[PDB]
Design a binder for this molecule. Structure first.
Ligand SMILES: C[C@@]1(O)OC[C@H](O)C1(O)O
Length: 314
């Protein structure tokens, strides 16, 4: 009877497939029919069309990873006015446009990981670094990058951010851009790619142009990144239990459907996971707080290498 919609940025990417599977698995254990559906490409119109669709069908809850902070707001607010529980995972909208943000960590946390991974691989205070992710308008990544760039200028002033280009979650376009940066910048020391499509594309671009001495860190799935790690192209990268993330999003949504207290400070017990807690929106850097509105932070983030890459199954 209760239907929950789980919308990714796009389909075909291993990151969203894992999260969607963990969501449907969670819904099945709760007796909830979770419908996993997303556009073939990350666009505003793509998700809005779907959001409006699940609303008209009368879905009870919709969990969405936004491709734009304010792009989905008119459709999300329409849903809540009809009683549709709106939650966000991975990528957030505006805090007033949703209810809960199932976040994998604060921008300071994930922004620290990107810099720490880079500093450990470059091992010199004077170098040239380049950023390379999906889109300049996406929410989650731009929040990380801004905190990352701020952290770099404070902790590594000798580092020169020479460029910042995009791939738009396209495996083809990401490869072209990655090669272009590598060609145009022969003095490049490191590439920071906080994107599941950008990170393996950068590693591939390094191997295609046979460029060594190049630190390549970022955020992607161990499934895709595995060949590049074994060959030594990527010594270190990071992510999180995305399967668990999709699992939490459903459980939290279920707590809203069953009228449980989920204000800032309250907790919730999840089987096989433990204790999650509603953190304030200030953790993301937001100036917005409300009753029944907060951020659920993931318990643990993971650093991947050649030692523990076969440990996680998504
Ligand atoms: C994990 C991730 O960085 O890869 C795809 C998205 O950009 C993402 O979810 O933020």
């Amino acid at each position: 009877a209760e239907r929950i919609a789980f919308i990714p940025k796009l389909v075909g990417v291993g990151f969203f497939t894992s999260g969607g599977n963990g969501a449907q698995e969670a819904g099945k254990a709760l007796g909830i029919d979770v419908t996993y559906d997303g556009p073939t490409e990350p666009s505003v119109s793509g998700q809005v069309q779907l959001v409006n669709n699940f609303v008209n069908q009368g879905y009870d809850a919709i969990i969405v990873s936004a491709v734009s902070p304010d792009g989905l707001c008119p459709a999300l607010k329409r849903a809540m006015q009809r009683g549709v529980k709106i939650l966000t995972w991975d990528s957030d909208t505006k805090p007033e446009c949703r209810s809960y943000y199932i976040n994998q960590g604060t921008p300071k946390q994930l922004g620290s990981m990107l810099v720490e991974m880079a500093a450990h691989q470059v091992d010199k205070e004077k170098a040239k670094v380049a950023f390379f992710y999906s889109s300049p308008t996406v929410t989650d990544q731009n929040q990380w990058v801004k905190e990352a760039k701020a952290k770099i200028s404070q902790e590594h002033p000798g580092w020169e951010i020479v460029t910042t280009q995009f791939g738009y979650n396209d495996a083809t376009k990401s490869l072209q851009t990655a090669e272009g940066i590598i060609k145009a910048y022969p003095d490049l020391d490191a590439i920071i790619a906080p994107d599941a499509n950008a990170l393996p594309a950068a590693a591939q671009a390094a191997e295609n142009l046979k460029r060594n001495n190049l630190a390549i860190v970022g955020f992607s799935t161990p499934n895709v990144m595995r060949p590049y790690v074994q060959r030594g192209t990527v010594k270190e990268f990071g992510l999180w239990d995305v399967v668990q993330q999709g699992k939490i999003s459903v459980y939290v949504a279920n707590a809203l459907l069953k009228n449980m207290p989920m204000n800032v400070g309250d907790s919730l017990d999840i089987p096989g996971i433990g204790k999650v807690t509603v953190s304030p929106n200030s953790e993301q850097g937001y100036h917005y707080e409300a009753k029944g509105n907060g951020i659920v932070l993931l318990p643990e983030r993971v650093i991947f290498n050649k030692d523990n890459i076969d440990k996680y199954d998504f």
